[PDB]
Design a protein around this nucleic acid. Structure first.
Lengths: 51, 52
DNA sequence: TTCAATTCGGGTAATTCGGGCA
DNA sequence: AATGTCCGAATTACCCGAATTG
């Protein structure tokens, strides 16, 4: 399963650009759409509620 | 060779099937057409894009 | 043959990117 | 470092009816 940047934005209650920024700095593995959009592996996103 | 319907591609990218059709229509993706003109894409190449 | 599910097309909203600024 | 916001441009998502699928 994959999640959109908006969804990941909602779960932490943070702006989706900040999700984009957690993708920047390495602590979120991001798969990219061939238009260059982010899709985040939802397992890692569990690891972030584990943290 | 194994073939994928645009709904399955759509699923693996978490992306609306229309957008996969756009990707085909814009050269980014190799498309095969059935006798009616529906697209079918090539599995192998599609994870050649998970390689990228 | 019929039948549910999908995938055509086009059009139009809604996200997302990216960079730069606060 | 670490978010939040404004902008423009690009990408993607939902809407429809009709055609194709298997």
């Amino acid at each position: 399963p994959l999640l959109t940047p908006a969804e990941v934005a909602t779960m932490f209650r943070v702006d989706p650009k900040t999700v984009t920024r957690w993708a920047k700095a390495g602590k979120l593995t991001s798969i990219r759409t061939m238009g260059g959009h982010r899709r985040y592996r939802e397992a890692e996103v569990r690891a972030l509620m584990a943290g």
